[PDB]
Design goal:
part of a larger assembly; 11 chains; A mainly alpha (30); B mainly alpha (37); C mainly alpha (449); D mainly alpha (35); E mainly alpha (32); F mainly alpha (150); G mainly alpha (61); H mainly alpha (56); I mainly beta (207); J mainly alpha (30); K mainly alpha (315); A: 30 residues; mainly alpha; rod-shaped; H: 56 residues; 38% helix; binds digalactosyl diacyl glycerol (dgdg); binds chlorophyll A; binds 1,2-dipalmitoyl-phosphatidyl-glycerole; binds beta-carotene; photosynthesis; photosystem II; PSII repair; PSII assembly; PSII intermediate
Amino acid sequence: VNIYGLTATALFIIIPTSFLLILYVKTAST
Amino acid sequence: KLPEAYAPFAPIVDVLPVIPVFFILLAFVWQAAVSFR
Amino acid sequence: GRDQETTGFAWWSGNARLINLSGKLLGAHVAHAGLIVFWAGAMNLFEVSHFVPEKPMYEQGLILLPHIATLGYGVGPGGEIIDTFPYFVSGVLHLISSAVLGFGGVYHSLIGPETLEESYPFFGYVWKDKNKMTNILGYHLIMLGLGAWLLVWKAMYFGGVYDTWAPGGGDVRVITNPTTNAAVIFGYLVKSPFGGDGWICSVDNMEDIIGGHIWIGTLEILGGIWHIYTTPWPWARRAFVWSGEAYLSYSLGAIGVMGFIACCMSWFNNTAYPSEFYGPTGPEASQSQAFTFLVRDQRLGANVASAQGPTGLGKYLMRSPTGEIIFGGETMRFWDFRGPWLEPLRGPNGLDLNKLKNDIQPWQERRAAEYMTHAPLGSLNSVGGVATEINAVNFVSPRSWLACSHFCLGFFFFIGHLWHAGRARAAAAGFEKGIDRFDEPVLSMRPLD
Amino acid sequence: MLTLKIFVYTVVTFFVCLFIFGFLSNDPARNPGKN
Amino acid sequence: NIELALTLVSLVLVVSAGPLVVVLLSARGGNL
Amino acid sequence: GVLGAALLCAIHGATVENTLFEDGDGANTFRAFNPTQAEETYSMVTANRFWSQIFGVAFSNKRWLHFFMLLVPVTGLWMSAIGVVGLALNLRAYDFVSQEIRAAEDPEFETFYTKNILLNEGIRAWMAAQDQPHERLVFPEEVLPRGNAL
Amino acid sequence: MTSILQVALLALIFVSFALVVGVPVVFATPNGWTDNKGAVFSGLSLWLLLVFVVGILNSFV
Amino acid sequence: LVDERMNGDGTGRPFGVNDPVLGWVLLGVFGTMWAIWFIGQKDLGDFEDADDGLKL
Amino acid sequence: LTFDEIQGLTYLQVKGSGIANTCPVLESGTTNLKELKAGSYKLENFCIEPTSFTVKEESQFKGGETEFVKTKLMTRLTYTLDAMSGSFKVGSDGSAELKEDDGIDYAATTVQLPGGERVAFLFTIKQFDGKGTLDGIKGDFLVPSYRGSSFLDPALKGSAVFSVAKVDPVTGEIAGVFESIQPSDTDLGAKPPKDIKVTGLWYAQLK
Amino acid sequence: MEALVYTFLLVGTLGIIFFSIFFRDPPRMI
Amino acid sequence: NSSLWARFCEWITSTENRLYIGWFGVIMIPCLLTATSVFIIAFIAAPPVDIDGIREPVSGSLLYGNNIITGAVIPTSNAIGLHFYPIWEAASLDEWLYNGGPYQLIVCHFLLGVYCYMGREWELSFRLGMRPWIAVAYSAPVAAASAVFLVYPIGQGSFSDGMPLGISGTFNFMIVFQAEHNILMHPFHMLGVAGVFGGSLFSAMHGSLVTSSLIRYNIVAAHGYFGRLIFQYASFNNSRSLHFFLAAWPVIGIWFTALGLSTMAFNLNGFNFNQSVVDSQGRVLNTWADIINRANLGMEVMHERNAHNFPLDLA
Ligand SMILES: CCCCCCCCCCCCCCCCCC(=O)OC[C@H](CO[C@@H]1O[C@H](CO[C@H]2O[C@H](CO)[C@H](O)[C@H](O)[C@H]2O)[C@H](O)[C@H](O)[C@H]1O)OC(=O)CCCCCCCCCCCCCCCCC
Ligand code: CLA
Ligand code: CLA
Ligand code: CLA
Ligand SMILES: CCCCCCCCCCCCCCCC(=O)OC[C@H](COP(=O)(O)OC[C@@H](O)CO)OC(=O)CCCCCCCCCCCCCCC
Ligand SMILES: CC1=C(/C=C/C(C)=C/C=C/C(C)=C/C=C/C=C(C)/C=C/C=C(C)/C=C/C2=C(C)CCCC2(C)C)C(C)(C)CCC1
Ligand SMILES: CC1=C(/C=C/C(C)=C/C=C/C(C)=C/C=C/C=C(C)/C=C/C=C(C)/C=C/C2=C(C)CCCC2(C)C)C(C)(C)CCC1
Ligand SMILES: CC1=C(/C=C/C(C)=C/C=C/C(C)=C/C=C/C=C(C)/C=C/C=C(C)/C=C/C2=C(C)CCCC2(C)C)C(C)(C)CCC1
Ligand SMILES: [Fe+2]
């Protein structure tokens, strides 16, 4: 219920997802 | 126990049940005789 | 023998070289049958030589004598043993018959003709004949039916069978009126296998067993006569593989199912497997413990009905989910157990309190104590009791050994069905050796699945 | 509550019959090999 | 004592009965 | 990781042995293999199609497949080693505070986690008496945790 | 007459051992079955006679 | 009785049917599927000759 | 089913049918109730079968008041008291007395009230002692603790009202309807006890 | 709240599995 | 043209589908989807289930104060025993939830699904002209699942002794089983552990050796490397032999561990070595087996808090 746990989970879900999407889009465009 | 008339032959029976197992081993020995042709 | 170059089968698969050698295959089968009979006779003699008639059979780890005793040979009322000569006779008869069968097998394997398709056309057969195979199947079906009718005659005319549901302790009885009604006989087969029903493991009287054996013997004789004078219909040829390995796989699957059924029947049933010889079952031990504790506490002076347990359900007696009065505690799972020593205390709606008060005979109490002592629990070291026990007992119930061994055998034979059925189908198709490498089926298929 | 039993029985029977009659429909000749 | 003696004697005799046939056939050049 | 490594070993062995090319005569396929041959002994395409139609995804690169087989167990045991390193300092993932508080507050709250906690307590109390002699622990029979039902 | 029964039983054991040692040898030996039919027939007949005699003696004991 | 139940758990009825409508449903579904298969049997090829079918 | 039909069935036939939880019905007899000769009798085969399990609950809405609401049963059957034995005295004027001594006089039960809350209790009438007319006899009984003292985490009295409805003087076999109110489970002191109202039928063979 | 987070995580994992099974890169030259 | 059934069976037995819907598939798919749906719905939200049959339920749902690790689908109630408990046999749906029906439904449908999955593996092996023994290898986890979910409840007489469908349920089941049967001391569990460890070892070794030999299909240099390393020249120089061994080892290990599980289902426990080494006077000397016995005794006393009422746990 703590804010720290929820925000850590959200960041861990989102940031690597964004990084992987960046790399995949770069690869697919090339 | 066995009937008294057959009492002396008690030891032989003690060996009988394990005989079939030996058969399978014999097969391997036979294969060793023919050098596993 | 042969070698790998001529046959294509390595030594560790050598018996596969006999698929198209009828004489050698027949010799092998006869020798194996001789081995089976030899083990039967030798083990019977071994158990006879180590049998102490004063003690119960299940307390000495005997698994073959209980069968003969259930057939009703040398057994008095209550399972007491009168004499042990018939066991010796059966052992020696199997031993000598096995000697003869072994001689026949070694002859047919070493000297007899390799293939008997031309010298003895009656016994010859091609795996794809589809008509000689049915002839052999009919012959063996007739033989099986004759065996079943032999059991029926033994139970009906020549002596009797050990009925464990007879008044008092069970004893040998003649089944004068077997249950031949079609509905009763065939209700067992279509009954559910789950708890309470139990499928064919729920037979609770010798009359039903004998009637069922009458039915199966007659059906097998009729089916054998049918199969001798008939060939499979086109729909049968359409949905079957006709090769030796295919028949082997069918037999493997059927016999694995049979092994599983035997495991369950040995574990649960106590009519065709009297507890006076095989020992108490799983549920029987727990029910006996509860009954003995109830009797002892009532004798010491207590109200068994008004004995609330720690959880409030009831220490001694409670109600089943259907409504019957049953023993309380963790034994609620075994509330549908039935036994000859407990039924006289059962009324229309379960256990009767009035009967539990002043209708318990001493033999019931003694049997309950004896069964509760010798629970089917055990250890691989033959210890007995729960795993957290001292080394003071040397008891493992025969029921546990039978169940475990036959379940393992059934599982392995189901695996054998899988293997041999797959290989037979592949070999009949023609790609059991590998992909063609030049006409590969996948390369001609549309890509992207 | 018995209507649920009827529906389940119908579905199970339909699927089991499909399975049974599927293998009777000349299944062994569905292989891609040459024979 | 004596019972164990006969047990071992029978055991060794019956065990040796097996490979003795193979040895005899190999010596006599049988089709083993 | 360990179970996945065993799974990968089993599937790779079965798939390779069930997709061989008919490189020789007879049924004994083991003999139909020349160790000096320069041709593949099993059909990668057939295995790929089979596993893509059965499971949904299938390998298409031999190097990647064998590297995955290498990589799974190594990662699994490295993570186990890190966990044991954490245990060495009593840094235990022992309890969930929320469920412990809920169980303490509500006497009707039971989960498999609480039953595991009770089993652990029983193990500790009944085993430390003889496991650690240097503590000279003498637990009276009345203080050992025990199911009161008996 | 337990002594006679035991002697006959021991003779049966010896004959059976000889038969089980000899029959595979006779069968697997090339050109051996043709020239040893009489010995094998006599051995088998003696085995059957001894087992029947042992049975009768058991009936008398 | 507080409520109503089917009351057939331990009765061991054949095929688990306690109402004739269940047996009628069983037979109807089986008959419909068998009729469809029988009608479509013409496309599966007839094994009229004595020696036919997959074999080795 | 009457007593004769119940006793005419073997155990195998009854098993799995739910009959074992039922209570015998008095088809014969008269409803006059004046054919019951005055005196004392040994009450045996005293059986009781409930029909409703309404529980008193506080209304969820603020403006509402506590009311008895219906519930759904959880435990499969196992809620029928049977084999009870005691004494039954009936007076010539019209007064009567009822007392229960022994038998299966209690049964643990759990019912869920609407909203998901499930409440357990111990349906019992043990040590009942009622006095009054044939119609409207009232008494009280003891309710033991729901669980024993040995239970570990991870007295009370209740009233009852019987009323004989039909009597069979030749063979006794008195039948009627009853209503009772008893406290709920109060174990662990985690919540205040609630009141369960139970109506049902009762049969007895006073001979 | 936390139950919703767990459900979202499981649903996302299942969606990724579905996309990987169906919207996969077609394999060429195996 | 062809009749309706001909077109239907052509579509079913078609290798052009994205996922092969075999004749085993026609049963596998509905059973597996039903089990998945019921499992998901029960895991997300389900009331506490009375596993012990002593009128105390345990909660295993996310909406009932649980998380992923401690959530589970609670096994069927002890009072049910081995009786069939479908939905239509319960008076109300809430009663079905209370007594633990969903576990039984999921277990039955899942077992049917895995059996038909093995069948479908064989079927698609057949339709593509492959040797059909992948299903034989797959049978080992299938056998283990059957022993865990079906054979053990049958032997113990109740479904409440089966494995709960949850992460903490697995650990509780394992602790229970070691307490009651001494799983660790059984030769078959030792063989299963050996099979699993050897599977991991051979997987890692084969992967490393093949990857290292895939220079710019395995060459003979890897065999020489392996022979030099562990002094086992000619032990594995045939690729087919090596891959067959890789397939055979873990499958046999898992078969034997599943058989040991099913054996203990009928109360045939493992080795017992407590009170074995004895002093000359007669005193008992403790051994590591005795410490294992002490741990088992500690596990057993707190096994069921309020379920037993008799001194000996016969059930
Ligand atoms: C699952 C377990 C359940 C519990 C146990 C039940 C046990 C029951 C045992 C008896 C039935 C066993 C049937 C097993 C399935 C195999 C059927 C089969 O291979 O069958 C294959 C054969 C093939 O038949 C052949 O088919 C050939 C092809 O015909 C085609 O070609 C012909 C011209 O050449 C014609 O044109 C014809 O119209 C055309 O269809 C020829 O017609 C041949 O003459 C003909 O003999 O069929 C036949 O054996 C004839 C039909 C056999 C009996 C079928 C009974 C089906 C049910 C009947 C009741 C239904 C009620 C429905 C009610 C609905 C409303 C409520
Ligand atoms: C009565 C049933 C039956 C029959 C007639 C056959 C017959 C055949 N099988 Mg099949 N098979 C069966 C059952 C049967 N099998 C079962 C149940 C299994 C599952 C285990 C198999 C698995 C199997 C495989 C995997 C293969 C065969 C093969 C063969 C062929 C050659 C076998 C040979 O030479 O072995 C020679 C004998 C040996 C190599 C000795 C093996 C000894 C092992 C270790 C068993 C040890 C037993 C041990 C004491 C107890 C085990 C544990 C216990 C708990 C059960 C032959 C056609 C082979 C073949 O060529 O197929 C065409 C082949 O590849 N079978
Ligand atoms: C009980 C199981 C069983 C049975 C019945 C058979 C039977 C047979 N096998 Mg198989 N086999 C088995 C197990 C079995 N085998 C196992 C476990 C293996 C793995 C090692 C093999 C591996 C194998 C191979 C590799 C081959 C066979 C072959 C054969 C056939 C010819 C054997 C022969 O000529 O040897 C001759 C052997 C001898 C002359 C040596 C002496 C053996 C004698 C007969 C022992 C008799 C002892 C007995 C107590 C005597 C009783 C006498 C009586 C009067 C009381 C025969 C039908 C061969 C075949 O296919 O034939 C074409 C073949 O190539 N087998
Ligand atoms: C073990 C002995 C044996 C064997 C191997 C066979 C084998 C065969 N028989 Mg014969 N038969 C036998 C005994 C045997 N029969 C006996 C004893 C009788 C007398 C009743 C008959 C009477 C008989 C007739 C009248 C006919 C055959 C036919 C056939 C052939 C087709 C069978 C088939 O595909 O069934 C397939 C079976 C079905 C499709 C039925 C549905 C199967 C469901 C799923 C099973 C339901 C099981 C049920 C619920 C009970 C549970 C039991 C439990 C173990 C699971 C086949 C060659 C037929 C043929 O072509 O030969 C001329 C034929 O017309 N048989
Ligand atoms: C009837 C059957 C229905 C489907 C059954 C389920 C199928 C699930 C398949 C999932 C595959 C996911 C692969 C993604 C990534 C992907 O697309 O992989 C693709 C990969 C193939 O890659 P290639 O060989 O094409 O790679 C070539 C290289 O050059 C570059 O990778 O397949 C594998 O690696 C096999 C290993 C799968 C391992 C799957 C483990 C199981 C899933 C994880 C656990 C899920 C738990 C969920 C909890 C809620
Ligand atoms: C083919 C072959 C084989 C096999 C074979 C076989 C398996 C055979 C069998 C055989 C057999 C199976 C035999 C048997 C025999 C037996 C006998 C010969 C017996 C006799 C008996 C006796 C002599 C007894 C006596 C007595 C009595 C009566 C009782 C008491 C005790 C006494 C001792 C006195 C193998 C693979 C291995 C190898 C190759 C070849
Ligand atoms: C004596 C006895 C009894 C009874 C018995 C009986 C009466 C039996 C019967 C039995 C039976 C009567 C059985 C049957 C069975 C059947 C089966 C087992 C079938 C199978 C089938 C199959 C396997 C098929 C498959 C398929 C199809 C589906 C089509 C074609 C193709 C294929 C192959 C895929 C009683 C209980 C009384 C008592 C006790 C004991
Ligand atoms: C009942 C009886 C009889 C008969 C007996 C018999 C007939 C026996 C047989 C027996 C046999 C028939 C035996 C056999 C044996 C064999 C063996 C014991 C072997 C062993 C071997 C081993 C152990 C080795 C192995 C190997 C090889 C060689 C190769 C691979 C590697 C190894 C090293 C593993 C008579 C009448 C005389 C009288 C007395 C009693
Ligand atoms: Fe590889």
